[PDB]
Write a structure and sequence with these properties.
This is part of a larger assembly, with two copies of chain A (48 residues).
Chain A: H1 2-47
């Protein structure tokens, strides 16, 4: 049981790290989405 | 020790969920970057 506890703590550390990276990449995705929408609007306006 | 194992196994499940999420977010980052690049190129060509 102690060995299992140690291994799973070693796992939870990576759990927290991965959660933080997920949050960061989600924010980056949101920023990229707004940038893409703005570029699409510019392209459309140039079209008209 | 059993309580610790159960809690840390839940955290390990969170680790797996975060790994899947980070992979999906990386894929969406690539997709957004590609869409932005093509939209920029199209708008530049239309403007020219």
């Amino acid at each position: 049981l102690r060995n299992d506890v140690e291994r799973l703590q070693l796992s939870e550390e990576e759990a927290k790290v991965a959660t933080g990276r997920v949050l960061s990449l989600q924010e980056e995705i949101a920023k990229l989405r707004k940038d893409l929408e703005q570029t699409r609007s510019e392209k459309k306006s140039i079209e008209e």
